[PDB]
Write a protein that binds this DNA or RNA. Structure first.
Ligand SMILES: [Mg+2]
Ligand SMILES: [Mg+2]
Ligand SMILES: [Mg+2]
Ligand SMILES: [Mg+2]
Ligand SMILES: [Mg+2]
Ligand SMILES: [Mg+2]
Ligand SMILES: [Mg+2]
Ligand SMILES: [Mg+2]
Ligand SMILES: [Mg+2]
Ligand SMILES: [Mg+2]
Ligand SMILES: [Mg+2]
Ligand SMILES: [Mg+2]
Ligand SMILES: [Mg+2]
Ligand SMILES: [Mg+2]
Ligand SMILES: [Mg+2]
Ligand SMILES: [Mg+2]
Ligand SMILES: [Mg+2]
Ligand SMILES: [Zn+2]
Ligand SMILES: [Zn+2]
Lengths: 49, 86, 77, 55, 190, 117, 169, 292
RNA sequence: ACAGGUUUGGUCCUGGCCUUUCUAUUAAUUCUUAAUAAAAUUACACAUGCAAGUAUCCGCGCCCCGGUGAGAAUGCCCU
RNA sequence: CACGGGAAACAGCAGUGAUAAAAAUUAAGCCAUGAACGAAAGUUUGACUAAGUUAUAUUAAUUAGAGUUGGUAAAUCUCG
């Protein structure tokens, strides 16, 4: 779920533009993956791209 | 000072006098009354049908004191002072 | 505050920090709470970075930006 | 910034060079660096003490 | 003073009318001072305890004058007729104490509408009034709420696996504290 | 002024007068002084409950998420505020402190009925 | 201001009230006029009256005059693109020149109002701070809130002194 | 298609019944004065200036909207039982963004009970005032609108000023705005004081009120004794529009009533006082016909 | 500045000085209690104490905050 | 400027000598904000918070003393 107010803002925001769909707004955690602190960091200097 | 003053005040030109020499309506715009055109004086006799020449930029003698006042360049500590009633 | 070159106190010398008592239950519960919470907020944060991508691209190279450009060029000529 | 009379500080450069050099030349062998006194739990090199939880 | 509760009375009395005429109360009073230009704020207060100081104010020389929000006939004298602004203390010559008293009084008075002032015409606050938008209008309650569950799974306290608890116990050993159970559901008072 | 490092942050500036605190929610560089220079003002928070028993918080949501979207960092109390508002999930520490508070009330309840005996 | 021929044109007001605002394409405006001839008249009054107004509103645009080079009065506009606008002002009035220039490269009143609208959304009403930038300083001064103790001294309980002297005992 | 206050028909009828009195519209105001300005005009330029002034006075006359009352807001966005005893007060969160319309801002409230709800109406308006102050509004509701002070102000006949305070202070769809406008109208009706609102921008208000409450008596009588019958007939016309099916409006369709006769129709069928109406219509008709 | 005092036996003009206003430091004389704000001779020399740590070792922090106005016509605004 | 050289540094908080017409505590806390570090509970912080001192300024009342009285400029009598 989106957090309570943010969900409301999104709902109302799409009512305003004429989108009627009542499908619940969902927050996608696929890219929110983080390694536990135990995971060792690379000492190698970063190549800038 | 008092000679000068009386001379000055004596030489005032009334709104009726002005109305008559220009032959127009002299109309007074109050700020508190908005755009509403109060007609102060009307030219007894025959009014002109001729508008006044519109001078884009007027040539008038200006006093550097009044201009300095208008633009907020008068900073004297003596001017704002609160005084007793008239 | 002190400086890199300002020698530490004589009293603080033989002292190193003393860590708090750990309540295992509450502590575990808490660690989970933090992991979840941070996940959620990481998501949200990405959501907003995207919003900024959009708004920037749209007010730069978007429709009405181009409309303005063309119209102004044409008016000019 | 630029003011027409600005002085040419030379030693600013000299100290940079010399410091970088004395850094590379005196650069510590990690043998002595992480060396540890097991009684006091204290590094000789850095004068640092180790955290209670790691003892 | 006999008036008190009915201050306005003294303004319609014959001794007032006799004393002040139709001029304002302060019209005949003149402040004494060191040069051409008076000091920029008036004397602080002209009565300290029992001692009435020197040449007293318009307001404090006549004790039958009462400053309330109620007598408009008195307060009116301290406002400009045309400009509807309150005179500064030097203009009139009242002492700072009574000038502040007056200012507050004229305020209360205007606030009970007993005294006239300028109420501008203002537009409405809103351009277009529509109670349609989500902000003002009811939302379709989230599926979490309808059930009665915590908005997220982890707001609720969930008992940990025993292997994990023992694992912690190994990690922090000797630095340990008393394990705590479930939190009490509702919180009682004293 | 030019700094070595440090990040953009959303924190509370403390304005106020002795015993009457007030806060300006602010996006500032990290290394600059608390009450000092800032990048943009975001909101305000008044801790003292007013005539109606309300603490007033103001949040410019649009700009807040603009900056979060540039990777600004939040202070623990700003986190707590947003969470309270419902713009962020509750901060775990709010929940935990709530629980601790509950257990204190419990042990004082029991201690009360133990002393009454 | 007394000295001068038309003193009103040295006033801040007069300078303000001229309306021309170049587009941002305009860098240099060059006036070329004559000191004599009847035809040249308008151009001269332009240099005498409006050039001050113009310049004041376009402080970054180089304006440059040349006298008695060409037999005829004209303006030249140098743009950023390299483009060069040439405006023949001959028997044209002072006013006509200003209007025609405002038409070619001006800014529509729409444009100007949008710009000033973007500048007036810069100082937000709900902020707090120094009188210079904000409507209010403390929140001590909003009606329902708690007042600056420098005005209305606090109830002894809210004082930190009292709290401390309580926890001590 | 029930007629509304903004319908061009009703707008034109009310604009007309209002009337343009350029001396009352533009009246000396108590603000700080600056010295007057003088220009010399033809008869022509004077007529032009007067017409511009009139167009300005139209804008000064633009009617404050009338709305029915707004619905109470009750919405809970969330319940966190966990937060329950943690705070003694309520947090109130106001979105402040410069772009957003004030009817679309989010105003949220964390209670001590833990529930996160939308703010009530009054809270909402008070809040918007705090962060987006606009002159004429006090955050705390001013003393003047209590019944006592109001009565005092009616007795000094300030009714115009009351209405203006009210338009500044409250919101047109609010409970108080409506309460005070109706109580005021009620008082100008009890006292026959209608002319106080005549060239005011507030005239159509008591028009539309008196039409819908079905008291046209006082306003008809007044309008006729002022020797304005074009307005009295515009008024009964309006009454007919907003009550298409009713005995007066129907009988005016049957008898094919001309304006004066229209007022007679209404006098017969509906109006609560027909005696005063018929008598005043009598006096007006006869006296006017013999005088002119 | 709404101005005032003062040149001469006297009048006018010109022209300075001073008064009247407002703030801050210091001093003298007086001084009851609260609250709030502010705290300032010194880039002269400094006794003593404290002002930078955290952290399962690495690391990361350590004139950043805070101080001061010595120097420099420095510089403001803007690329 | 700081490789070097004089030489041994409070222009951090308090303090102190000298010097000047110029005079705040060798104080309590990290409870709030900020900062550092920590995955975290958290620890540290003379930043700061709450206090101490002072008629420097405002305000409130419990507090009466100072200056002046030829003119400018409010106000005087008798002695020496
Ligand atoms: Mg270390
Ligand atoms: Mg302070
Ligand atoms: Mg002489
Ligand atoms: Mg002499
Ligand atoms: Mg002189
Ligand atoms: Mg002293
Ligand atoms: Mg500094
Ligand atoms: Mg020099
Ligand atoms: Mg050096
Ligand atoms: Mg020191
Ligand atoms: Mg140091
Ligand atoms: Mg000393
Ligand atoms: Mg001092
Ligand atoms: Mg001493
Ligand atoms: Mg802290
Ligand atoms: Mg902490
Ligand atoms: Mg300490
Ligand atoms: Zn007095
Ligand atoms: Zn304050």
């Amino acid at each position: 779920p989106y957090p309570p107010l943010l969900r409301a803002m999104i709902l109302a925001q799409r009512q305003k533009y004429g989108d009627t769909s009542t499908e619940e707004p969902m927050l996608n955690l696929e890219r929110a993956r983080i390694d536990p602190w135990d995971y060792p960091a690379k000492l190698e200097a970063k190549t800038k791209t | 000072l008092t000679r000068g003053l009386f001379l000055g005040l004596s030489r005032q030109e009334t709104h009726q006098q002005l109305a008559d020499k220009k032959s127009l309506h002299v109309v007074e715009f109050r700020e508190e009354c908005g755009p509403l055109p109060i007609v102060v004086a009307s030219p007894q006799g025959a009014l002109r049908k001729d508008p006044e020449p519109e001078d884009e930029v007027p040539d008038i003698t200006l006093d550097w004191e009044d201009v300095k006042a208008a633009q907020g360049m008068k900073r004297s500590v003596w001017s704002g002072l609160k005084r007793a009633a008239t | 505050r002190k400086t890199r070159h300002d020698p530490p106190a004589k009293s603080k010398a033989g002292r190193v920090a003393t860590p708090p008592a750990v309540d295992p239950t509450e502590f575990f519960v808490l660690t989970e709470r933090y992991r979840q919470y941070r996940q959620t907020v990481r998501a949200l944060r990405l959501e907003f970075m995207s919003e900024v991508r959009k708004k920037l691209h749209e007010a730069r190279a978007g429709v009405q930006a181009e409309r303005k450009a063309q119209e102004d060029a044409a008016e000019h000529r | 910034m630029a003011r027409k009379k600005v002085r040419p500080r030379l030693i600013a450069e000299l100290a940079r060079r010399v410091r970088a050099l004395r850094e590379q030349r005196e650069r510590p062998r990690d043998s002595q660096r992480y060396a540890l006194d097991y009684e006091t739990m204290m590094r000789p090199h850095s004068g640092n003490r180790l955290p209670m939880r790691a003892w | 003073s006999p008036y008190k509760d009915e201050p306005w009375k003294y303004l319609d009395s014959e001794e007032y009318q006799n004393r002040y005429g139709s001029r304002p109360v302060w019209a005949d009073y003149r402040r004494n001072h060191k040069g051409g230009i008076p000091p920029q704020r008036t004397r602080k207060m002209c009565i300290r305890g029992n001692k009435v100081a020197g040449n007293p104010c318009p307001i404090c020389r006549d004790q039958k004058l009462h400053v309330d929000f109620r007598n408009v006939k008195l307060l009116e004298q301290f406002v400009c007729a045309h400009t509807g602004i309150i005179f500064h203390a030097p203009y009139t010559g009242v002492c700072m104490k009574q000038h502040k008293k007056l200012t507050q009084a004229i305020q209360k008075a205007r606030d009970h509408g007993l005294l006239r002032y300028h109420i501008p015409q203002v537009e409405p606050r809103d351009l277009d009034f529509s109670t349609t938008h989500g902000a003002v209008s009811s939302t379709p309650p989230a599926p979490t709420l309808v059930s009665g569950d915590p908005w997220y799974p982890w707001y609720s306290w969930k008992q940990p696996p025993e292997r994990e608890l023992s694992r912690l116990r190994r990690l922090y050993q000797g630095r340990l504290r008393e394990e705590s159970g479930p939190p009490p559901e509702l919180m009682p008072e004293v | 002024r030019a700094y070595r490092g440090g990040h953009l942050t959303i924190r509370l500036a403390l304005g106020g007068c002795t015993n009457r605190p007030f806060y300006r929610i602010v996006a500032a560089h990290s290394k600059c002084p608390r009450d000092g220079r800032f990048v943009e003002q975001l909101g305000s928070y008044d801790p003292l409950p007013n005539s109606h028993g309300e603490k007033l918080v103001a949040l410019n949501f649009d700009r807040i998420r603009h900056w979060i979207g540039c990777g600004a960092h939040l202070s623990k109390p700003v986190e707590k505020l947003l969470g309270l508002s419902g713009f962020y999930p509750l901060h775990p520490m709010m929940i935990t402190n709530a629980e601790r508070l509950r257990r204190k009330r419990a042990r004082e309840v029991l201690l009360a009925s133990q002393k009454t005996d | 201001p007394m000295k001068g021929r038309f003193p009103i044109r040295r006033t801040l007001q007069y300078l303000g009230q001229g309306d021309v605002v170049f587009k941002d394409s305009v860098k240099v405006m060059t006036v070329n006029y004559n000191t004599h001839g009847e035809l040249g008249e308008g151009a001269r009054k332009f240099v005498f009256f409006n050039i001050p107004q113009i310049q004041y509103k376009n402080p970054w645009v180089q304006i440059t005059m040349f006298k008695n080079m060409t037999p005829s009065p004209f303006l030249r506009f140098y743009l950023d693109s390299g483009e060069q606008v040439l405006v023949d002002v001959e028997s044209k009035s002072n006013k006509e020149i200003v209007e025609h220039i405002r038409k070619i490269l001006g800014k529509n009143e729409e444009t100007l109002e949008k710009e000033e609208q973007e500048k007036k959304q810069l100082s937000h009403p709900a902020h707090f701070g120094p009188r210079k930038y904000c409507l209010r300083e403390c929140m001590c001064e909003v009606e329902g809130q708690v007042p600056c103790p420098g005005l209305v001294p606090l109830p002894k309980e809210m004082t930190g002194k009292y709290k401390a002297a309580l926890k001590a005992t | 298609r029930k007629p509304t206050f903004m319908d061009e028909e009703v707008q034109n009828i009310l604009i007309k019944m209002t009337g343009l009195d350029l001396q009352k519209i533009f009246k000396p105001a108590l603000q700080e004065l600056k010295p007057p300005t003088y220009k010399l005009m033809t008869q022509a330029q004077l007529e032009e200036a007067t017409k511009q002034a009139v167009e300005a006075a139209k804008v000064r006359l633009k009617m404050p909207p009338v709305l029915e009352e707004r619905a109470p807001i009750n919405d809970v966005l969330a319940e966190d039982k966990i937060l329950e005893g943690t705070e003694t007060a309520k947090y109130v969160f106001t979105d402040i963004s410069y772009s957003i319309p004030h009817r679309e801002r989010f105003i949220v409230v964390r209670e001590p009970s833990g529930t996160l709800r939308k703010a009530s109406w009054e809270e909402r308006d008070r809040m918007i005032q705090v962060y987006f102050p606009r002159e004429g509004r006090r955050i705390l509701t001013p003393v003047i609108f209590k019944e006592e002070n109001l009565q005092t102000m009616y007795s000094q006949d300030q009714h115009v000023d009351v209405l203006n305070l009210c338009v500044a202070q409250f919101e047109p769809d609010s409970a108080e705005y409506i309460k005070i406008h109706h109580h005021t109208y009620e008082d100008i009706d009890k006292c026959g004081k209608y002319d106080l609102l005549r060239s005011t921008r507030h005239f159509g208000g008591m028009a539309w009120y008196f039409v819908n409450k079905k008291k046209i008596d006082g306003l008809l009588i007044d309008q006729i004794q002022r020797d304005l019958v074009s307005d009295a007939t515009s008024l009964v016309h309006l009454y007919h529009i907003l009550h298409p099916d009713g005995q007066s409006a129907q009988e005016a369709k049957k008898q094919g009533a001309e304006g004066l006769h229209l007022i007679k129709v209404f006098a017969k069928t509906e109006a609560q006082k027909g005696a005063y109406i018929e008598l005043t219509l009598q006096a007006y008709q006869e006296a006017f016909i013999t005088h002119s």
